[PDB]
Design a binder for this molecule. Sequence first.
Ligand SMILES: Cn1nc(C(=O)NC[C@@H]2Cc3ccccc3CN2)c2ccccc21
Ligand SMILES: [Zn+2]
Length: 140
Amino acid sequence: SGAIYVGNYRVVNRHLATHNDWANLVWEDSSRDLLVSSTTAQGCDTIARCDCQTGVYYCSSRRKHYPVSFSKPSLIFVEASEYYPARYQSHLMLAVGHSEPGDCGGILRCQHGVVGIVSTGGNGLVGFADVRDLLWLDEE
Ligand SMILES: Cn1nc(C(=O)NC[C@@H]2Cc3ccccc3CN2)c2ccccc21
Ligand SMILES: [Zn+2]
């Protein structure tokens, strides 16, 4: 679990969005596992605007933050998991490291702020849904 709180937006994994999320929807993409809903409260997170490929991600299944190198956002085959069919997620970044399902929503961060959220994993890789191209998270 986990979310990004920027301005009056809440960014979550689309597969973990609540009814309150869907009832207050701004934007959703199955192609990215991202959903953004509206909040009453102002959030304190800053979105990175950059092309960093090093950062740190939170791994709930180890109660640890890990430093990683990651690929630039791309179109990636997510091999079938026990609970999710094979599908192609887009705007996806991969790193070598530990992940399990309940780590989806963990933040990846660089020197510039929040880069993305854990979205995929398997065979010793962890996949992050990028948010750095969503410039509108910064305004309105
Ligand atoms: C961190 N992590 N995440 C997942 C995961 O399945 N997330 C669901 C999410 C939504 C979804 C829906 C349809 C098709 C594919 C997908 C893929 N991404 C996972 C599985 C094994 C190990 C680690 C993992
Ligand atoms: Zn950066």
